[PDB]
Structure 1
Amino acid sequence: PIDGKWNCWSNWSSCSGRRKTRQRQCNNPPPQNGGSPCSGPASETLDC
């Protein structure tokens, strides 16, 4: 089983809800009877 790995979180989005995103891309779990998906937060948002 390949367990999930996060990619680096995306850069800070503009104001009105400053935001970042993540994709579980860096190691997608499904291969070889994949293991668990990655934890959240798959996206994260904050004050400007």
Structure 2
Amino acid sequence: WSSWSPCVQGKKTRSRECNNPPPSGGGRSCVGETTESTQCEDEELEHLR
């Protein structure tokens, strides 16, 4: 993963793009999702305290 982008509207993002030697010779595409987005950590900081 490219390290998580700073938060917008309570969510991060991150991207991985199969940048190792690509699916080749008719081989199947990389098994997974290119991008993820996840909710931010601010609820720990506010709530558990």
TM-score (norm 2): 0.65
1:45 pairs, out of 34, 37, 49, with 37
Match of residue 25 from structure 1: 19
Aligned residues: 38
Q: Larger relative CO (CA 8 A, sep 6+): 1 or 2?
A: 1
Unaligned runs of 5+ residues in structure 2 are 41-49
Per-residue CA deviation, residues 14-40 of structure 1 (Å, 9 max, x unaligned), is 10120110111112012xx23111012
Q: How many percent of aligned residue pairs carry the same amino acid? A: 34
CA RMSD of aligned residues (A): 1.1
Q: Per residue, is there more strand in 1 or in 2?
A: 2
Cα distance in 1 for partners of 2:26, 2:39 equals 36
TM-score (norm 1): 0.66
The runs of at least 4 aligned residues of structure 1 exceeding 2 Å deviation read: none
